[PDB]
Design a protein around this motif. Sequence first.
Motif, PDB file in Angstrom:
ATOM      1  N   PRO A   1       0.830  -1.205   0.000  1.00 33.94           N
ATOM      2  CA  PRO A   1       0.000   0.000   0.000  1.00 33.94           C
ATOM      3  C   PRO A   1       0.860   1.249   0.000  1.00 33.94           C
ATOM      4  CG  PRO A   1      -0.066  -1.099   2.130  1.00 33.94           C
ATOM      5  CD  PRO A   1       0.602  -2.038   1.189  1.00 33.94           C
ATOM      6  N   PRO A   2       0.584   2.191  -0.906  1.00 31.95           N
ATOM      7  CA  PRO A   2       1.389   3.418  -0.951  1.00 31.95           C
ATOM      8  C   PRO A   2       1.342   4.214   0.335  1.00 31.95           C
ATOM      9  CG  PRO A   2      -0.568   3.617  -2.317  1.00 31.95           C
ATOM     10  CD  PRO A   2      -0.462   2.178  -1.940  1.00 31.95           C
ATOM     11  N   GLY A   3       0.219   4.205   1.053  1.00 31.93           N
ATOM     12  CA  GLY A   3       0.160   4.919   2.317  1.00 31.93           C
ATOM     13  C   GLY A   3       1.050   4.316   3.387  1.00 31.93           C
TER      14      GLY A   3
ATOM     15  N   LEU B   1       3.175  11.695  -4.166  1.00 32.96           N
ATOM     16  CA  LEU B   1       2.131  12.515  -3.566  1.00 32.96           C
ATOM     17  C   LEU B   1       1.815  12.059  -2.148  1.00 32.96           C
ATOM     18  CD1 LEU B   1      -0.198  12.897  -6.657  1.00 32.96           C
ATOM     19  CD2 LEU B   1       1.015  14.745  -5.499  1.00 32.96           C
ATOM     20  N   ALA B   2       1.791  10.745  -1.911  1.00 35.22           N
ATOM     21  CA  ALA B   2       1.524  10.252  -0.562  1.00 35.22           C
ATOM     22  C   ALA B   2       2.593  10.721   0.420  1.00 35.22           C
ATOM     23  CB  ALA B   2       1.426   8.727  -0.573  1.00 35.22           C
ATOM     24  N   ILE B   3       3.866  10.601   0.036  1.00 28.37           N
ATOM     25  CA  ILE B   3       4.951  11.024   0.916  1.00 28.37           C
ATOM     26  C   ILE B   3       4.931  12.535   1.104  1.00 28.37           C
ATOM     27  CG2 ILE B   3       7.445  11.037   1.239  1.00 28.37           C
ATOM     28  CD1 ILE B   3       7.556   8.432  -0.326  1.00 28.37           C
TER      29      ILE B   3
ATOM     30  N   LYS C   1      -0.041   7.326 -16.243  1.00 32.25           N
ATOM     31  CA  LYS C   1       0.750   8.435 -16.769  1.00 32.25           C
ATOM     32  C   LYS C   1       2.136   8.478 -16.137  1.00 32.25           C
ATOM     33  CE  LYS C   1      -1.338  12.205 -16.419  1.00 32.25           C
ATOM     34  NZ  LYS C   1      -1.946  13.193 -15.485  1.00 32.25           N
ATOM     35  N   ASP C   2       2.215   8.279 -14.822  1.00 30.72           N
ATOM     36  CA  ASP C   2       3.474   8.362 -14.091  1.00 30.72           C
ATOM     37  C   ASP C   2       3.436   7.456 -12.866  1.00 30.72           C
ATOM     38  OD1 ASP C   2       6.011   9.113 -13.392  1.00 30.72           O
ATOM     39  OD2 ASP C   2       5.439  11.065 -12.567  1.00 30.72           O
ATOM     40  N   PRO C   3       4.174   6.341 -12.875  1.00 32.19           N
ATOM     41  CA  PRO C   3       4.141   5.434 -11.713  1.00 32.19           C
ATOM     42  C   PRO C   3       4.619   6.077 -10.423  1.00 32.19           C
ATOM     43  CG  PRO C   3       5.182   4.403 -13.630  1.00 32.19           C
ATOM     44  CD  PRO C   3       5.066   5.855 -13.938  1.00 32.19           C
TER      45      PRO C   3
END
Lengths: 43, 162, 108, 177, 155, 38
Positions: free
Chosen positions: D26-28, D105-107, D97-99
């Motif tokens: 999870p990115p978060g 953005l999360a960080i 568009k951009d991995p």
Amino acid sequence: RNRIPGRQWIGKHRRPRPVSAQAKQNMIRRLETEAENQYWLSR
Amino acid sequence: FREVVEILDGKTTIIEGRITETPQESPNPPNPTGQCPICRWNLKHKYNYEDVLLLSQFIRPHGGMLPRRITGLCQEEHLKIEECVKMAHRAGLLPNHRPKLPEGFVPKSKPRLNRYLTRWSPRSVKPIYNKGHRWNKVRMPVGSPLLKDNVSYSGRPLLLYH
Amino acid sequence: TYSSLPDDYNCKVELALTSDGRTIVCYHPSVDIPYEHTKPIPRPDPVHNIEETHDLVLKTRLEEKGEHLEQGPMIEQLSKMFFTTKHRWYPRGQYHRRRRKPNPPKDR
Amino acid sequence: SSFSKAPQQWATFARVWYLLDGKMQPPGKLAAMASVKLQGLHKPVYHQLSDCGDHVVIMNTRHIAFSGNKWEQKVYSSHTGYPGGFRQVTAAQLHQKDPVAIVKLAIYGMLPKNLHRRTMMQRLHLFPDEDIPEDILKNLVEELPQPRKVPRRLDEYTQEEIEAFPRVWSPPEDYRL
Amino acid sequence: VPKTSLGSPPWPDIVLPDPVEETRHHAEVVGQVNELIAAGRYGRLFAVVHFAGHQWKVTAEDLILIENELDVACGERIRLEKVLLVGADNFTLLGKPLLGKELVRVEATVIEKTESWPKINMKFQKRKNYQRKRITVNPQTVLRINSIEIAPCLC
Amino acid sequence: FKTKGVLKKRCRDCYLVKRRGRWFIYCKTNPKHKQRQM
RNA sequence: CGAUGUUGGAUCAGGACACCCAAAUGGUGCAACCGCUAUUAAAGGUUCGUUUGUUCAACGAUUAAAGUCCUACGUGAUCUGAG
Ligand SMILES: [Mg+2]
Ligand SMILES: [Mg+2]
Ligand SMILES: [Mg+2]
Ligand SMILES: [Mg+2]
Ligand SMILES: [Mg+2]
Ligand SMILES: [Mg+2]
Ligand SMILES: [Mg+2]
Ligand SMILES: [Mg+2]
Ligand SMILES: [Mg+2]
Ligand SMILES: [Mg+2]
Ligand SMILES: [Mg+2]
Ligand SMILES: [Mg+2]
Ligand SMILES: [Mg+2]
Ligand SMILES: [Mg+2]
Ligand SMILES: [Zn+2]
Ligand SMILES: [Zn+2]
């Protein structure tokens, strides 16, 4: 975008802020303390 | 298990039903008096979407679920297992339980997005453009409300909406 | 043997309680890095500017390396090299230069 | 312990490079620990004024996972400033568009909202795949554990474990799948 | 036995040593620490002590500032009785919550009996014409921790 | 299709199916019975 | 109220969708052309004149259409002063 008409906390339409589990636990603890007090005030 | 085989020879068709050996229940269930499979094997409130070894016991080879009158589950356990199977299929678990289409497997598409604990169908959800403020916040459902009764070792209730 | 924490990182903790029970003692000898957990020191020695005809000129070529850049590209290079932003390297005016303490206090 | 003043200072305040695999994570949960490392809140010598902050290198950014339907529900809103230039892009479209964008953005959101946020964001390196330049690779010190334990798919299971798991029910012989 | 995600708790199972072996090992460790103390192989000792309402982590040749005046003259030696923690490079003794007076002895010499810099205390109320200015000059004392001794009376 | 808050079958041939996250009264004999839950 | 200067118009328009046109469809008591409703979509458009200070309104000629509103009934340190 989601305006609150009038003030947040006084008008007919207020802010719908809910009740938390911490608030419930605090009220339950106070109720237990008062029950003990009214038991000790019995005899 | 039963299979139907078709043979064609000289404009003549013969279909035959062949029965092959199938696995049986394990000899020693921990709670033999239970009337329900899960509820007598003591898996009630114990499985999740990632327990594929249990979720794949009764699903069709093409991913479909099995009828309750055949499996023997109680209604709530059947619904929980159906939701868990859906979540696993969406998450990407059980990769061999799909139909084989050689003509459609060649035109590869965009890489699959990794996901898990997905409640709704991926093609049926609309993006939440407004998202609301703190007093009226649009929450994103995660997991299913059917599994809210699972055992919680940490004691914190599951966040089904976040 | 028993230990609440692993004894792999810099000390070996051994807890105990005195017979009276009013004191907790703990022996924590330090741990040295074993020889098998290290690697040999890398050596970098290369003199490619040496010339077989004029050693003085060879030394001069290797010692006279110079370069100049504008403020913009220079600050960009400094920020890229130190993993900072370009705003750190810009100077400050007289009001901020003259209000620095000439003799800051020192401890120890 | 008996170091000189300058080498003791250098050892105490030295910067460390951490590695973080973002595959099926999870990115978060990646961003929380990445931001902790970036701020330096894992150092007992930490202070807001001090520049104590370590580098975080996150790989396999393209293979992150969103819990639930966040891939189609979560949106990212930007405004070019010009009238009619308000864009709301879905999380899936932004990832295509951009991995790097999702975890970046999360960080950025989890980092503190002071002026040091840009400085400590310059110390964050994000790579869509396991293709890291050798210059960055030679700087790594340790690899942090992945916050989420990735479940194993059915065909990844061992046959021994498959046969060890009991059959909870006995299907009838006459039934056809 | 089924092995599901929630069938087992998500933490390593802990097994504790048997009480008699634990007590024997504790006796062995206490004896080793006591023999180290008796041999005097410890280099330098630090101590966390309680004094004047605060806890100080002090070593030998140390300086501390106390925000209240003491009933002693300058240059007098004082035994700090409340010692919560003692530590060296190898061993460390904790109190529950205090150590023994016979076990640890900390001495401090009074250096300077002075007063603090003038601290400003101003209260101000908007559009109510309430301003109140006060100057605080708190008496202070300086203590030099000289030596920290430990005795081999450790059972 | 008519967008309604309450869906009811207007004949015996109406069948209720969930598609695209909504509920639908689909009818083949009478196409005017097509209803979509809002 | 030790001043937040007003209708209408000119110039420039930003936005909403409860879409007038243009686009994709469902149902019709939809045979076709005209139509009547509903769904989705706001990147772009949405006329010139007589009378009236007019916003409106009537009328003439057209257009694919001449949309409803918000913006201090947008905009007078950009303009007019017909009321
Ligand atoms: Mg208000
Ligand atoms: Mg109100
Ligand atoms: Mg006024
Ligand atoms: Mg004024
Ligand atoms: Mg406009
Ligand atoms: Mg619409
Ligand atoms: Mg049209
Ligand atoms: Mg428009
Ligand atoms: Mg008005
Ligand atoms: Mg106006
Ligand atoms: Mg103006
Ligand atoms: Mg005007
Ligand atoms: Mg003027
Ligand atoms: Mg006039
Ligand atoms: Zn059951
Ligand atoms: Zn019908």
